[PDB]
Design an enzyme around this catalytic site. Sequence first.
Site, PDB file in Angstrom:
ATOM      1  N   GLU E  60       8.277   4.224   3.467  1.00 21.96           N
ATOM      2  CA  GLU E  60       6.925   4.253   4.034  1.00 21.96           C
ATOM      3  C   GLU E  60       6.902   4.341   5.574  1.00 21.96           C
ATOM      4  OE1 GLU E  60       3.707   2.595   5.406  1.00 21.96           O
ATOM      5  OE2 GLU E  60       3.324   1.328   3.614  1.00 21.96           O
ATOM      6  N   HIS E  61       7.877   3.707   6.227  1.00 21.91           N
ATOM      7  CA  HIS E  61       8.041   3.801   7.676  1.00 21.91           C
ATOM      8  C   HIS E  61       8.698   5.103   8.119  1.00 21.91           C
ATOM      9  CE1 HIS E  61       7.023  -0.430   7.958  1.00 21.91           C
ATOM     10  NE2 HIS E  61       7.143  -0.371   9.273  1.00 21.91           N
ATOM     11  N   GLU E 137       7.407  -6.382  12.451  1.00 20.90           N
ATOM     12  CA  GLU E 137       6.280  -6.556  11.515  1.00 20.90           C
ATOM     13  C   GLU E 137       6.449  -7.765  10.594  1.00 20.90           C
ATOM     14  OE1 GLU E 137       5.825  -2.755   9.596  1.00 20.90           O
ATOM     15  OE2 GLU E 137       4.578  -1.953  11.239  1.00 20.90           O
TER      16      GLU E 137
END
Lengths: 57, 54, 49, 53, 446, 423, 151
Positions: E60-61, E137
């Site tokens: 996803e990153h 994060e």
Amino acid sequence: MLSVAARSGPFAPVLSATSRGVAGALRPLVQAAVPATSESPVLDLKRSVLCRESLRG
Amino acid sequence: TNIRKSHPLMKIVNNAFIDLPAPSNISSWWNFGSLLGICLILQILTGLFLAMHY
Amino acid sequence: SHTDIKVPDFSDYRRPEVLDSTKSSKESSEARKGFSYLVTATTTVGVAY
Amino acid sequence: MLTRFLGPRYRQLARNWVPTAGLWGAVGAVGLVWATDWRLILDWVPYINGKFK
Amino acid sequence: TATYAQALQSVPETQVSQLDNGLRVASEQSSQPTCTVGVWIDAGSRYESEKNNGAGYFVEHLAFKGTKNRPGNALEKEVESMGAHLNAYSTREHTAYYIKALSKDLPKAVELLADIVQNCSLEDSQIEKERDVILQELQENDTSMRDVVFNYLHATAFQGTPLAQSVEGPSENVRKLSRADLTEYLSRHYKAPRMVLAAAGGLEHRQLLDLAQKHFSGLSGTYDEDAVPTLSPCRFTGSQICHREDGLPLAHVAIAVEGPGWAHPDNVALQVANAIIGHYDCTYGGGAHLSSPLASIAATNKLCQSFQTFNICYADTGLLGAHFVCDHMSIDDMMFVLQGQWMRLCTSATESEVLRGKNLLRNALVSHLDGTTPVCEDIGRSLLTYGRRIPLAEWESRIAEVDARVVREVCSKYFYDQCPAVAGFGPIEQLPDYNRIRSGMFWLRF
Amino acid sequence: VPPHPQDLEFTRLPNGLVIASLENYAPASRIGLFIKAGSRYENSNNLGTSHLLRLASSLTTKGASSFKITRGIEAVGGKLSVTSTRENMAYTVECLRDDVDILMEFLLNVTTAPEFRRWEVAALQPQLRIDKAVALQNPQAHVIENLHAAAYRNALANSLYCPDYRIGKVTPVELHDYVQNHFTSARMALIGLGVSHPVLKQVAEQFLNIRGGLGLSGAKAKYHGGEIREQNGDSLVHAALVAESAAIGSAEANAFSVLQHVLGAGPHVKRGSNATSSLYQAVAKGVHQPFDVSAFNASYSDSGLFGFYTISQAASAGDVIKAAYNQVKTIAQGNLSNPDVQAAKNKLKAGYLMSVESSEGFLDEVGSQALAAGSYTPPSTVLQQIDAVADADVINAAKKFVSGRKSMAASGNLGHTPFIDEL
Amino acid sequence: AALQPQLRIDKAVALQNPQAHVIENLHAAAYRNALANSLYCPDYRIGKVTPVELHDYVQNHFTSARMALIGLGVSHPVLKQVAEQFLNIRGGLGLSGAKAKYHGGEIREQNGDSLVHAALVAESAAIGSAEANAFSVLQHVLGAGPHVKRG
Ligand code: HEC
């Protein structure tokens, strides 16, 4: 094109009977939480995070 | 809110026999306090029923 | 960092009907509450006498 | 002072609670019958026959 | 005129056609000048191993940072220049990548999604840059008491199961995950029968299927010939996690019973019961006069800064219950008032409050399905969970069927004398002992 | 085959009121009464009156009690929302199609028959402190309050939140006064989605014939300038730099809106370097730490503020600001390609269209259009408006900002944050 | 830790003269710099001043070259003695002028408050210079406080 939401910039507050209060337009953020170490003012005598009248089947 | 917490009779009971913050580690040696209370009451109920015929 | 917090393994203490991670607990909830509530029902019955 | 308690919700509230209120009466009855030994009620019970003449 | 009933029939049928790949391709058409297009994937954290726990979250990153046809910048530059928005998300069960763009821009939109989903340039320099980004994060998420308590609730309710894991994974797995680890999950999961191409807006289902064959066809040849993965059931455990921190000003508590899962018809009645209890937050204007007894007792007695009910669904399982935030001295009363309402509903739900619950739910369902993004999301998710789009009239049908009896039968099935999963965080000295919480799951009067 | 879409009905009544409806055949319905009654119409004697008013939407009316408004709307599962901006208040009401009638009635009572009871107002005063505290936890809210207090000597200087000294000081009479002289026909618009034009026109003719207050949309924003500085400690620094631009509706504003997309609004891609964002690329060149920068664009009835907004570490503040500022300077100097503007056009056009695609954003736009313009301008011609903006206008917008008397708000550790003086 | 709350009381007791905030604000607006700082602690700092910050403040400001020991009803040898014995500290800053950069502008505080307080000011002259004495005379030409009770 006359709306202070459609010209994404100045502030708008929202109050309701059943729903949580909202604020503002644009203004940085979102591209400020990708360059990390932005924990944000979280919960120190505060409202519901996200708002929920988005319930499903 | 809670009936068991705010009633001027149930409140007094709640804070002594129900919601009382007690240590997690008290021995069987701490049982004698209540067992004394049982003993005292037991002596009263046998005592009275004895006092009726004595 | 809070994402490292896994719950310690309980296999040592778990009732046998719920030792399988791939098995639904609902299957055995009825039978498991049954035992502990039967113990209680039998206790009160004994006390009642 | 009682007209406030009559309406469709209370009709539902009474019906919702009646199987329970009936079963507590059965508890109280069996409970009273068993405790005093009401041989009046208990004579007609197919195993409890302690009055075994 | 137009009756509420008639309006539901007017919403056009979500049209479904399937590619030879197994890529289900679906759309809901309208006269809109814009659209949302996306790929929904049957992958999350529930598919991960413990040893590759942040894998989906890592892709996803990496997904937007370069392909074989569009190295580095190129993708952004293309999407940005047509005025489109490109987003992604990952739950424990589902991963989605979608584009909000002009309807005329649908040819490039589908094209870019194809490149993102099939040709991810997992350049080792970028995976290392993402390592720091994800770790940063992780520290960021730690400060969100709500994000924590739900991860904690997942961790304790699904003790020892893949569902116990978070979407982002633990720190060590972020620190040590390799390109191989990443490619392997990618190849094992981003397979066509587990992908739905969804779109909504000024479309033509004909034009979308054309594009789906144009850009996604390229997953044929041979498929699934060595190994196939199907999900194992996840054991729910009635348990407690208490993270005691007397330096945070408000307590977060999330309490839940096991729910049934996506497919189950009785999610409707649950949702209705949840609607009745609802949700409160200190910025609500109603206060004392709110219908929900919990909301009104919360407001009057300021028992709470906020509470919300939830029915989180996973395949064959879920989490049903409420989460609240409050002052240290109000945890006990919040629990009592909450559990008392669950029991009130379990034993003595009345007809009118069930109408309000149904009414709130029809309003929620219709308000949510507003615009290309929410509807496109609904097509993608629905096909992945229900295997079809459940039309609005069917939802209305299934809502209208719920009466007071249904609520109390269904609430009892799930709540009555059931073991909660309980997660607490912050100033929690006053958080009730598990036995006490478990005792609130029944009533001696009933 | 979907349904062939209906057309929006529009009507100005002789009394000045505006009605706009669209039968979209939606399963739900939305009605908004929009009023020229925002924060700007407050004066130095009644500040925060329109805040408490915004908070008062379910207090007791003639014809519907507090308890009825709540339980009545909740029974049918609808909402009553109120959104203030510096220019408008907007009372919005949502429900299923079959229930438009009860919510309309409630709407009319809240807006036309509010009773403002002494004790009810007394009990609601503390909500001002919570409401203000919950907004002000975004560093952006105070920055934009302060930005306005410094820009204008006047009406737009007023904040959408009530000053602390006023909390518990707003009288029941002040709100009665605010309603009687702002919630009038000629200052109003009744917008309906999932409703019919005859019904809106009927309720407008029956219930919304009020007139006996102020007239001017321009009690008149006197732009002034200067800066406000708030030492904070606070993790990172927030700063907005701004000059007077263009009143909403004018051709100039559209140039400013394009300038905003040349430089950079919010992101488009989840976690991206924001490649097309010329402001972001400019700061990034010599700042190698966490930061954010966006063009800020605020448009009002009789003034406007354009510039940029920055989030940065305490020590990088001045570098981030100076870099952003110089980037604007280069566009004023002439350094702007045709495809640069073309992309900004596409970013704006797409963004606008997306902004109205839901019924919430649609109703708000038709509402704000009705008040600012007295017209409904379809997307087709808004896109035509945007297209008419030439490269030379966007340059002229940047030229106006650079050479114009600035306004600045900022909060954090201000140790390394410049002063207009030093820009 | 126990003394931190005295900052909030101390500040509250001064700030009940409308003049205190006016002169805080007057300075914050006049100078971009050092004289901009107020004699009272900003709210965001209350409970945030560390034991180390004060140690630091003393070690680098309470030094010989920044100090004067004045005595009334005492003898010079005794003062000179304690000065020689106890006040030989040096290891901090040097300049009396870390340097006030005068800037200008205004601060406005809406109050409600019975009547209005306003101070209007320009940069004048550093204490000691001949110019300052002209300013001090100007002040008496125009008017300081009263001389006669109720006049
Ligand atoms: C109701 C009054 C009453 C109370 C209360 C009472 N008793 Fe008694 N007790 C009696 C009577 C009467 C007797 C004599 C009958 C008997 O010996 O059984 C007696 C007998 C006794 C005896 C002689 C036992 C024997 O039979 O050899 C002792 C010892 C005694 N009690 C101690 C206590 C103690 C200790 C208490 C609790 C503090 C107590 N009693 C409570 C009335 C009472």
